[PDB]
Design a protein around this ligand. Structure first.
Ligand SMILES: [Mg+2]
Ligand SMILES: [Mg+2]
Ligand SMILES: [Mg+2]
Ligand SMILES: [Mg+2]
Ligand SMILES: [Mg+2]
Ligand SMILES: [Mg+2]
Ligand SMILES: [Mg+2]
Ligand SMILES: [Mg+2]
Ligand SMILES: [Mg+2]
Ligand SMILES: [Mg+2]
Ligand SMILES: [Mg+2]
Ligand SMILES: [Mg+2]
Ligand SMILES: [Mg+2]
Ligand SMILES: [Mg+2]
Ligand SMILES: [Mg+2]
Ligand SMILES: [Mg+2]
Ligand SMILES: [Mg+2]
Ligand SMILES: [Mg+2]
Ligand SMILES: [Mg+2]
Ligand SMILES: [Mg+2]
Ligand SMILES: [Mg+2]
Ligand SMILES: [Mg+2]
Ligand SMILES: [Mg+2]
Ligand SMILES: [Mg+2]
Ligand SMILES: [Mg+2]
Ligand SMILES: [Mg+2]
Ligand SMILES: [Mg+2]
Ligand SMILES: [Mg+2]
Ligand SMILES: [Mg+2]
Ligand SMILES: [Mg+2]
Ligand SMILES: [Mg+2]
Ligand SMILES: [Mg+2]
Ligand SMILES: [Mg+2]
Ligand SMILES: [Mg+2]
Ligand SMILES: [Mg+2]
Ligand SMILES: [Mg+2]
Ligand SMILES: [Mg+2]
Ligand SMILES: [Mg+2]
Ligand SMILES: [Mg+2]
Ligand SMILES: [Mg+2]
Ligand SMILES: [Mg+2]
Ligand SMILES: [Mg+2]
Ligand SMILES: [Mg+2]
Ligand SMILES: [Mg+2]
Ligand SMILES: [Mg+2]
Ligand SMILES: [Mg+2]
Ligand SMILES: [Mg+2]
Ligand SMILES: [Mg+2]
Ligand SMILES: [Mg+2]
Ligand SMILES: [Mg+2]
Ligand SMILES: [Mg+2]
Ligand SMILES: [Mg+2]
Ligand SMILES: [Mg+2]
Ligand SMILES: [Mg+2]
Ligand SMILES: [Mg+2]
Ligand SMILES: [Mg+2]
Ligand SMILES: [Mg+2]
Ligand SMILES: [Mg+2]
Ligand SMILES: [Mg+2]
Ligand SMILES: [Mg+2]
Ligand SMILES: [Mg+2]
Ligand SMILES: [Mg+2]
Ligand SMILES: [Mg+2]
Ligand SMILES: [Mg+2]
Ligand SMILES: [Mg+2]
Ligand SMILES: [Mg+2]
Ligand SMILES: [Mg+2]
Ligand SMILES: [Mg+2]
Ligand SMILES: [Mg+2]
Ligand SMILES: [Mg+2]
Ligand SMILES: [Mg+2]
Ligand SMILES: [Mg+2]
Ligand SMILES: [Mg+2]
Ligand SMILES: [Mg+2]
Ligand SMILES: [Mg+2]
Ligand SMILES: [Mg+2]
Ligand SMILES: [Mg+2]
Ligand SMILES: [Mg+2]
Ligand SMILES: [Mg+2]
Ligand SMILES: [Mg+2]
Ligand SMILES: [Mg+2]
Ligand SMILES: [Mg+2]
Ligand SMILES: [Mg+2]
Ligand SMILES: [Mg+2]
Ligand SMILES: [Mg+2]
Ligand SMILES: [Mg+2]
Ligand SMILES: [Mg+2]
Ligand SMILES: [Mg+2]
Ligand SMILES: [Mg+2]
Ligand SMILES: [Mg+2]
Ligand SMILES: [Mg+2]
Ligand SMILES: [Mg+2]
Ligand SMILES: [Mg+2]
Ligand SMILES: [Mg+2]
Ligand SMILES: [Mg+2]
Ligand SMILES: [Mg+2]
Ligand SMILES: [Mg+2]
Ligand SMILES: [Mg+2]
Ligand SMILES: [Mg+2]
Ligand SMILES: [Mg+2]
Ligand SMILES: [Mg+2]
Ligand SMILES: [Mg+2]
Ligand SMILES: [Mg+2]
Ligand SMILES: [Mg+2]
Ligand SMILES: [Mg+2]
Ligand SMILES: [Mg+2]
Ligand SMILES: [Mg+2]
Ligand SMILES: [Mg+2]
Ligand SMILES: [Mg+2]
Ligand SMILES: [Mg+2]
Ligand SMILES: [Mg+2]
Ligand SMILES: [Mg+2]
Ligand SMILES: [Mg+2]
Ligand SMILES: [Mg+2]
Ligand SMILES: [Mg+2]
Ligand SMILES: [Mg+2]
Ligand SMILES: [Mg+2]
Ligand SMILES: [Mg+2]
Ligand SMILES: [Mg+2]
Ligand SMILES: [Mg+2]
Ligand SMILES: [Mg+2]
Lengths: 100, 129, 88, 65, 65, 271
RNA sequence: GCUUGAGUCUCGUAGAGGGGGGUAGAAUUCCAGGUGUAGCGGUGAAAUGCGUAGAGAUCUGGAGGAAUACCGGUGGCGAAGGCGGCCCCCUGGACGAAGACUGACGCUCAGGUGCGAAAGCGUGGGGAGCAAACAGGAUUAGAUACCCUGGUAGUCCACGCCGUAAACGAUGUCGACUUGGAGGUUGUGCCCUUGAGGCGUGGCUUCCGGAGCUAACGCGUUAAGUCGACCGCCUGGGGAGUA
RNA sequence: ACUAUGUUCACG
């Protein structure tokens, strides 16, 4: 139904899990009609300030179409999970490509 | 919100004369053509037309003698909030009979001077000095 | 909010065709459609007084169209209310 | 100078910080329109994108961290 | 704010501070600026600005100086 | 809702009832009920140890489940029931296997909702977990003070503990008193808040409402004679002695805490 | 009957419009510890106040609560009250583009209903900062004040009540008509985007001025000009918006 | 820094 733009950050030691993390978040959305348009793993990028007393967070950009039930279920999996240091979910205005 | 169309006509004439404007366009009507022609026939307005089929726009052409305008003053008398119907003998004479009062009588729209001689009164629309 | 399919469904049913979309029959139904969607919004929230003013505009607007329709024709006025579930 | 370009239009996005870091001062604050040109519309899109970039620690809030 | 000035120089030169903050932290968030009073004291600082700028166009008088 | 009763009689005037519309109207599940005879405040020796208790309505004990022993087994909430033995309400939980048990009803709960408990499970209101597995800065209740025991802390209507911090094997809990107590991380805790939060807005209204709750009248020391209570005597409303219990110990600001054993666990005393 | 009034449908644009739920960073306060050695704090000048029990300053870790620097403007949105970190959920309206439809469905509105800053009030929370009352210290002829150090209701949230403000453009609502200029802001079309262009036509808006109006000050296409519809209100000052 | 008051009617 609606387009989104998820940009979440992950802790250094659990960056090896991120390949596994993406495959679970894809499987939740890809089944329910809307496809993921563009993923792009950013990598272990430096932080502008220390979050949780550490530097270097592992950024991941999904950008995906989904209904409201699946996206809010994905929104809850970030809060009830110590690996993910912050995330945000933006709104529609069509699909996009490139840009970093 | 546009309750009296006739008062609006007489403002466009009044404000057009203040602005020193040549012509005055507005939406037309049955009562608009009747008043506009009576003003023309005596000689406040210098010619007019009713150009249009579906959405007619009656435009007047205002008269000027000197730098001053011809229509000294013009005002609504029988406004819709208070209708004013005067009897034959009780008909007014604007500016002691050298200005006219447009009066809707039973034999069509006419001046106060013609109403006296024709032998009838009616709704006094507007004084024109 | 009323989606494109929701309005177009009501428009191509009460009126003549999808082309016709301004009739008092159509207009009242679109308001009744939005008003009934807004009841679930004002079930909770409650303090949303600014949206209520938009609703009470739609409510009053609907009464003016129905009061117009009644004076215009008593036949189609009564038939419209039986289908929409107004009068109460 | 002004906006993006002559035939740019586009939208000011938070992800890119190379072109975005020009619009903030050395302290970390957002630079006003009366200094850097920019129309009121694109300054508001910019100001929002700075604040979103700050949430993700792409840009810093300040320089006392 | 973070000003090193290489090595041979010293002599302060930290206008970076004075032309950035200081006034914002101090003579503003020192004591209570009563919500309304800014709306008053700005709109009079704003009215005094265009008063000068409109006068600056008409400042070219005879003078004879 | 919290419905105020109309003043059709003096005694009715001030009554405020807590009318829960979702509770079951009928007899309870017998297998979990049992007899609960009253003490009247007296003990082995037959003597009034606790004053002001005696009488009231007869009331049976429901075997409520504080331990929550069922691991990895889903359980459907069949119906919310009234409990006379408690401030809070209870929920008749039907486990997927066949068992039925009474548990304390949290806030967000109705007849039809599903609850799971154990080690894994999901983070949701009603789902019992070890406190290690629960996220820090979350609302819990029915909290154990020892691993494998029942559940001591936050069981009354609207009561809840908040998990403040998590130091390795220990969990710092901020209790409803305001006391910050350190408990073991292996201990369990039921997520969310204990239901029936309107309970506190009930106001009884009459003397007999306290008498049919099993309370008896509290005579003031000042009203008594000097032989009875330390406050006593005087020819017409005297006092002039410092406030005290019937046994001379000072009330009104006098710390009676003297455990010593569990003073290590208390991170900070209430205020 | 008709279509220019009024309303509906399509498509986009902007916005601190609203309600509910999250979370972010700076700071402030207190809490625990490290460092450390006499002051700190304040003021017109002092004192009360905190400090050799080791304060202030400095660092580290924690808990809280409230408010969102810069962007931010004679900027925007809202009927008014009013509304500013960032993100999703539901949601009201506004404006533009060219059509299609309805066919006067409109404008005002006594009674009536709804919303309505702040301070209050009730009940349950919450309480860092600030701060009526209150206390102490100065000031003073006196100081129930102004200044200083403390500091409770309150200020914050949920649910109701209150129904007032210089609730102010001190300017009722709707519509028509009548020289300009300089901006801001948001649209939309036509050529070359042939280079941050231009050239047009719509909304909202700040400033200066023409005729005209005004007791004057001033207002001046957003009139206080020129007219129409309807409403509210006024009839010397005190008494009194009181009995 | 703080810093009070000027009896009544008249003369213009
Ligand atoms: Mg004709
Ligand atoms: Mg026609
Ligand atoms: Mg015709
Ligand atoms: Mg009925
Ligand atoms: Mg009904
Ligand atoms: Mg009826
Ligand atoms: Mg009924
Ligand atoms: Mg203000
Ligand atoms: Mg039995
Ligand atoms: Mg017993
Ligand atoms: Mg015995
Ligand atoms: Mg015995
Ligand atoms: Mg006892
Ligand atoms: Mg007792
Ligand atoms: Mg009992
Ligand atoms: Mg008692
Ligand atoms: Mg007693
Ligand atoms: Mg007693
Ligand atoms: Mg007695
Ligand atoms: Mg006695
Ligand atoms: Mg005895
Ligand atoms: Mg004794
Ligand atoms: Mg006695
Ligand atoms: Mg005696
Ligand atoms: Mg006695
Ligand atoms: Mg006595
Ligand atoms: Mg005595
Ligand atoms: Mg004693
Ligand atoms: Mg036709
Ligand atoms: Mg039209
Ligand atoms: Mg129209
Ligand atoms: Mg539409
Ligand atoms: Mg739209
Ligand atoms: Mg928008
Ligand atoms: Mg936008
Ligand atoms: Mg907005
Ligand atoms: Mg908003
Ligand atoms: Mg809002
Ligand atoms: Mg709320
Ligand atoms: Mg909100
Ligand atoms: Mg933080
Ligand atoms: Mg404190
Ligand atoms: Mg220290
Ligand atoms: Mg030392
Ligand atoms: Mg002294
Ligand atoms: Mg001293
Ligand atoms: Mg000392
Ligand atoms: Mg020491
Ligand atoms: Mg200290
Ligand atoms: Mg310190
Ligand atoms: Mg506290
Ligand atoms: Mg404004
Ligand atoms: Mg506006
Ligand atoms: Mg508005
Ligand atoms: Mg904002
Ligand atoms: Mg917030
Ligand atoms: Mg909406
Ligand atoms: Mg709209
Ligand atoms: Mg048509
Ligand atoms: Mg027709
Ligand atoms: Mg037709
Ligand atoms: Mg009246
Ligand atoms: Mg009224
Ligand atoms: Mg009200
Ligand atoms: Mg208030
Ligand atoms: Mg209160
Ligand atoms: Mg009271
Ligand atoms: Mg109450
Ligand atoms: Mg309390
Ligand atoms: Mg209170
Ligand atoms: Mg309290
Ligand atoms: Mg306090
Ligand atoms: Mg408290
Ligand atoms: Mg203070
Ligand atoms: Mg003070
Ligand atoms: Mg008081
Ligand atoms: Mg005092
Ligand atoms: Mg003095
Ligand atoms: Mg003296
Ligand atoms: Mg003194
Ligand atoms: Mg005093
Ligand atoms: Mg004093
Ligand atoms: Mg009081
Ligand atoms: Mg809130
Ligand atoms: Mg509140
Ligand atoms: Mg009321
Ligand atoms: Mg008033
Ligand atoms: Mg105001
Ligand atoms: Mg104002
Ligand atoms: Mg205004
Ligand atoms: Mg007024
Ligand atoms: Mg008004
Ligand atoms: Mg009105
Ligand atoms: Mg009205
Ligand atoms: Mg007008
Ligand atoms: Mg012009
Ligand atoms: Mg202009
Ligand atoms: Mg322009
Ligand atoms: Mg303009
Ligand atoms: Mg140009
Ligand atoms: Mg315009
Ligand atoms: Mg203006
Ligand atoms: Mg004006
Ligand atoms: Mg002005
Ligand atoms: Mg002017
Ligand atoms: Mg104009
Ligand atoms: Mg003009
Ligand atoms: Mg203008
Ligand atoms: Mg015009
Ligand atoms: Mg105009
Ligand atoms: Mg106007
Ligand atoms: Mg304009
Ligand atoms: Mg006017
Ligand atoms: Mg006037
Ligand atoms: Mg009156
Ligand atoms: Mg009156
Ligand atoms: Mg009088
Ligand atoms: Mg009155
Ligand atoms: Mg009053
Ligand atoms: Mg009164
Ligand atoms: Mg004196």
């Amino acid at each position: 139904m609606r387009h989104y733009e998820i940009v979440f950050m992950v802790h250094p030691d659990q960056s090896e899990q991120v390949p596994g993390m993406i495959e679970r978040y894809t499987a939740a959305i890809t089944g329910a009609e809307g496809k993921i348009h563009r993923l792009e793993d950013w990598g272990r990028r430096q932080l502008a300030y220390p979050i949780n007393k550490l530097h270097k967070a592992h950024y991941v950009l999904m950008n995906v179409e989904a209904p409201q039930e699946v996206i809010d279920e994905l929104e809850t999996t970030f809060r009830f999970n110590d690996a993910v240091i912050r995330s945000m979910v933006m709104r529609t205005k069509h699909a996009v490509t490139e840009a970093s | 919100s546009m309750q009296d169309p006739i008062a609006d006509m007489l403002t466009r004439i009044r404000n057009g004369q203040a602005a020193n404007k040549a012509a005055v366009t507005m939406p037309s009507s049955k009562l608009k053509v009747a008043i506009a022609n009576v003003l023309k026939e005596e000689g406040f307005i210098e010619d007019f037309k009713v150009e249009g089929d579906t959405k007619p726009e009656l435009e007047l052409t205002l008269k000027y003698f000197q730098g001053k305008a011809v229509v000294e003053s013009i005002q609504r008398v029988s406004r819709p909030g208070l209708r004013i119907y005067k009897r034959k003998d009780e008909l007014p004479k604007v500016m002691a009979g050298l200005g006219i009062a447009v009066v809707s009588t039973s034999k069509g729209v006419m001046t106060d001077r013609a109403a006296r001689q024709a032998g009838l009164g009616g709704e006094i629309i507007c004084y024109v000095a | 909010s009323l989606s494109t399919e929701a309005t177009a469904k009501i428009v191509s049913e009460f009126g003549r065709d999808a082309n016709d979309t301004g009739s008092t029959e159509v207009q009242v139904a679109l308001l009744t459609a939005q008003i009934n969607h807004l009841q679930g919004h004002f079930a909770e929230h409650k303090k949303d007084h600014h949206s209520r003013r938009g609703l009470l505009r739609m409510v009053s607007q609907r009464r003016k169209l129905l009061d117009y329709l009644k004076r215009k024709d008593v036949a189609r006025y009564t038939q419209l209310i039986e289908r929409l579930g107004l009068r109460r | 100078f002004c906006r993006f370009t002559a035939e740019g239009v586009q939208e000011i996005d938070y992800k890119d910080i190379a072109t975005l870091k020009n619009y903030i001062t050395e302290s970390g604050k957002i630079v006003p329109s009366r200094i850097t040109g920019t129309r009121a519309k694109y300054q508001r899109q910019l100001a929002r994108a700075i604040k979103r970039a700050r949430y993700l620690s792409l840009l810093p809030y300040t320089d006392r961290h | 704010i973070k000003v090193r000035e290489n090595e041979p120089f010293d002599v302060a030169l930290r206008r970076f501070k004075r032309s950035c903050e200081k006034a914002g932290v101090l003579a503003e968030v020192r004591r209570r600026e009563f919500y309304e009073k800014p709306t008053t004291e700005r709109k009079r600082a704003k009215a005094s600005a265009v008063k000068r700028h409109a006068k600056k166009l008409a400042r070219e008088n005879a003078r004879r100086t | 809702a919290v419905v105020k009763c109309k003043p059709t009689s003096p005694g009715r005037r001030h009554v405020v009832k807590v009318v829960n519309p979702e509770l079951h109207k009928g007899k309870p599940f017998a297998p979990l009920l049992e007899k609960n005879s009253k003490s009247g405040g007296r003990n082995n020796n037959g003597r009034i140890t606790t004053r002001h208790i005696g009488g009231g309505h007869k009331q049976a004990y429901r075997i409520v489940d504080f331990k929550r022993n069922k691991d990895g087994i889903p359980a459907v909430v069949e119906r919310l029931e009234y409990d006379p033995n408690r401030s809070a309400n209870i929920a008749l939980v039907l486990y997927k296997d066949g068992e039925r048990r009474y548990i304390l009803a949290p806030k967000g709960l109705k007849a039809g909702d599903q609850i799971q408990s154990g080690v894994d499970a999901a983070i949701k209101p009603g789902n019992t977990l070890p406190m290690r597995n629960i996220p820090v800065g979350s609302t819990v209740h029915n909290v154990e003070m020892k691993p494998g025991k029942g559940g001591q802390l936050a069981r009354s209507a609207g009561t809840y503990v908040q998990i403040v911090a998590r130091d390795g094997a220990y969990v710092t809990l901020r209790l409803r008193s305001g006391e910050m107590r350190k408990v073991e991380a292996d201990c369990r805790a039921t997520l969310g808040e204990v239901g029936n939060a309107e309970h506190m807005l009930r106001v009884l209204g009459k003397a007999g409402a306290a008498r049919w709750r099993g309370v008896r009248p509290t005579v003031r020391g000042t009203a008594m004679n000097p032989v009875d209570h330390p406050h006593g005597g005087g020819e017409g409303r005297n006092f002039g002695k410092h406030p005290v219990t019937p046994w001379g110990v000072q009330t009104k600001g006098k710390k009676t805490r003297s455990n010593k054993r569990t003073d290590k666990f208390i991170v900070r005393r209430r205020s």
